[PDB]
Amino acid sequence: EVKSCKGRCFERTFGNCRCDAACVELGNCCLDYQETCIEPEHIWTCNKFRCGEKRLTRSLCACSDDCKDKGDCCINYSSVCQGEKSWVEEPCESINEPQCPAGFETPPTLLFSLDGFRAEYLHTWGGLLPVISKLKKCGTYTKNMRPVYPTKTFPNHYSIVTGLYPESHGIIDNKMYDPKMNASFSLKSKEKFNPEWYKGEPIWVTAKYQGLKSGTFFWPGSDVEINGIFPDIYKMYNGSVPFEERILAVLQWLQLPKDERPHFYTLYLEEPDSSGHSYGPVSSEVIKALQRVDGMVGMLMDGLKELNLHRCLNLILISDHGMEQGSCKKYIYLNKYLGDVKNIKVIYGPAARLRPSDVPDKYYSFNYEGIARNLSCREPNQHFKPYLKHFLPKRLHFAKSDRIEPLTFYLDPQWQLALNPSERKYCGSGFHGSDNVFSNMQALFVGYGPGFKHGIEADTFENIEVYNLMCDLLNLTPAPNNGTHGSLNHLLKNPVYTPKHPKEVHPLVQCPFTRNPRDNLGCSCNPSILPIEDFQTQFNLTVAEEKIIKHETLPYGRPRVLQKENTICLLSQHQFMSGYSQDILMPLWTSYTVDRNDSFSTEDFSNCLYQDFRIPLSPVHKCSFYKNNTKVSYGFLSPPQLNKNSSGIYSEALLTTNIVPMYQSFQVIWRYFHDTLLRKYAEERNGVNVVSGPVFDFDYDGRCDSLENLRQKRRVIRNQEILIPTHFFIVLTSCKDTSQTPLHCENLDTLAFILPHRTDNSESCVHGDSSWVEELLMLHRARITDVEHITGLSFYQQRKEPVSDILKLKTHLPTF
Length: 816
Ligand SMILES: *[C@@H]1O[C@H](CO)[C@@H](O[C@@H]2O[C@H](CO)[C@@H](O[C@H]3O[C@H](CO)[C@@H](O)[C@H](O)[C@@H]3O)[C@H](O)[C@H]2NC(C)=O)[C@H](O)[C@H]1NC(C)=O
Ligand SMILES: *[C@@H]1O[C@H](CO)[C@@H](O[C@@H]2O[C@H](CO)[C@@H](O)[C@H](O)[C@H]2NC(C)=O)[C@H](O)[C@H]1NC(C)=O
Ligand SMILES: Nc1ncnc2c1ncn2[C@@H]1O[C@H](COP(O)(O)=S)[C@@H](O)[C@H]1O
Ligand SMILES: *[C@@H]1O[C@H](CO)[C@@H](O)[C@H](O)[C@H]1NC(C)=O
Ligand SMILES: *[C@@H]1O[C@H](CO)[C@@H](O)[C@H](O)[C@H]1NC(C)=O
Ligand SMILES: *[C@H]1O[C@H](CO)[C@@H](O)[C@H](O)[C@H]1NC(C)=O
Ligand SMILES: [Zn+2]
Prior knowledge:
By secondary structure, the chain is of the alpha+beta class. It has an 8-stranded mixed sheet, sandwiched between helices. The longest helix has 23 residues, at 284-306. It is built from 23 helices and 35 strands. It is elongated, with a radius of gyration of 32 Å. Residues 338-339, 341, 374 line the site of one 2-acetamido-2-deoxy-beta-D-glucopyranose. Residues 164, 168, 199-200, 397, 480-482, 701-703, 789 line the site of a molecule of 3 linked components (NAG-NAG-MAN). The record marks 810 as: Essential for catalytic activity.
């Protein structure tokens, strides 16, 4: 009492220890002077020094006995000064019925972003992060949320609230140039506030049109007039506002009367991204930053508990991207290869892009291909790869927008690129922006509230799926977006949207056998191959025989075509089924099944085709059209090397209906896949269902071109109009359980590819062993959903599983 400042801050005294500002110089302050009298001006917490304090006028919050009555207690008052449990101290309790005030018949959703919180931080430092660890334990968690490319702040935040890829929402980076606008985007510029930049519909706009209000305390686009709308409450970005004030403001919004109180909220903190850059992802500063944000989340949860909203609000704790350690030894300078040239502007970092400096004049006319070829395969194990945006892997969906420079660079993990050492920051800092499948780029996601399941660890999903999920939690109709609505139904207690397989628009045409003359196709067939001598006999199949074929080749149902004006017909064979397009003189898809103990022949089958009498014969279906053709060759969808009955060559696979145009350079990849890889996959998985086909994406928009658009994209080769695929897709399907074969799976294990169809193999740097083919396949892996979008096909429509469980499977991207 006599030795303490409690009750007497700033009052003068004769009785020994002092409690006025002069005491410090004299070193005769009471031991508790700072804690009792000064600290309260600078902190938002109660402590054992402050419990029952005489109210101070300058204190940020109160711990005085009268604080509950005046309603300005520090958030931790009850826990510290009345011995009640904090939110984190309480054991998990399930939230089956929400406990909400009137106005929250639909509960609120809060989107809470920790910038640059890599998923790995929680994997390794969970023991140092009790609040986030408890949200994981009590809630719905994934070890990894996959961000969008490039893995940067504005693209990923705007992707989260729109469900769009950056190529569609238009925010592709923190610095952009738009040629059509002839303007540059910068966060320091006034162009940041120009609505022209922000495409799509953020969830706060979706919400407003359907009568819910929004409160954003910082989010990319929330301080911009998008479709003529701001959030009902928004803050002009000011990184200097302390984290505690942002959280206290959101807690004020949740106490507004129901007429003006938002349903959708955002909260954004700059940590741990800021510390990640400045000190690296493995550092004392990042540990301290992680503990600080853990405490801020705890402050929100304690605040919600005080308001009795902790079993009402749906919390989505999220991050935009991860963080990697940069190195000056892992930075590439283009001036080494190009010299100190002054005609190009190079966007530096791991997501490096190149543009002419003379814009908008030379933006399209500039010789990108020149520099592409100049920078290809210059060193062995080169750590960067030049790509024309349309040749990047389709899984990145990084090409449609004109704001994406025609020449991009793909960089290996930990590697960055600039023009020269002058035009970058510090090379040794932490960075992000790399490929969105790299481990250290993976993001945080925890869902907690009445809408979310409890104690669930979901498989990896993409942040573009979150918009639909938030719409479901708010009973909103989602705007068109790149999420698959229902793919995240497994995260929710009570899904509101039941998805249905899409309807096939035109019913399948039939391609009947027509008697016609055995023609010369100009083939020099290998003697070994037993030809088809009675076609009418060999392809007149009994209902019984067909049921056996269908069961073996379409165990999941036939791919369905969703294209508007398209006429496909089913072609049956003993080892494979196919959907043939008369309009493009080519199959859209084949389906077959390689069994564990099947044989692959090394026997030559070049310059051999057999006529299919089910379709009219065409010049492009003849060996003669391809004989010494320098511009294009051909390849088979269903592989002739695969024989079940004989050990020779499966003759039916040599039909004119099972060939697609194919560059000689691509034949190496295709030959290696069917000869070597497909055999290894069949063995390892105890059988593999295969569906392969061509892909036409001339608009490089990740979508199948219309038949109308395809009629203008045909090339003329030897005075014939031929359509040459942009890509080839493959979809492998085995069982999770290798005890079962692909016709009797309880759970499907899938692996899909969208292989670019290029005239050379410059991408793979072929010099030193066809091991490079596997690397190319992995880099160009895709979600089945990516294949569906780009082919206009829809798979697995006859699996017994509920539709949402299939959508989960189709949106999966594999890791290795
Ligand atoms: C991701 O979802 C996007 C939103 O649905 C979708 O983008 C939309 O793409 C269509 C097709 O280009 C555009 O619609 C336009 O179609 C005509 C062509 O005849 C255009 O001339 C008109 O502008 C018309 O609006 C939309 O503009 C476009 N929306 C946005 C926001 O970009 C993407 O296709 C989806 N991406 C993938 C890979 O599936
Ligand atoms: C950005 O936010 C910071 C902190 O919230 C504001 O800076 C404060 O300004 C007040 C008076 O204007 C000073 O008394 C404080 O000392 C400042 N705090 C700090 C820590 O700098 C600043 O005003 C804000 N800028 C705006 C409104 O954009
Ligand atoms: N809504 C916003 N408006 C403007 N700037 C923002 C906004 N949100 C975050 N920032 C800032 O943009 C910067 C980009 O982060 P990066 O450098 O890790 S890609 C961040 O450091 C952040 O400090
Ligand atoms: C494009 O912007 C540049 C930069 O200010 C300017 O000099 C020029 O007038 C603009 N217009 C065109 C189309 O070149
Ligand atoms: C690439 O072109 C640059 C000019 O920008 C030149 O310095 C260099 O010699 C060229 N490199 C080659 C031919 O690969
Ligand atoms: C094409 O003709 C044969 C096809 O068997 C091939 O061996 C040869 O290399 C090619 N000839 C020319 C002129 O390229
Ligand atoms: Zn960020």
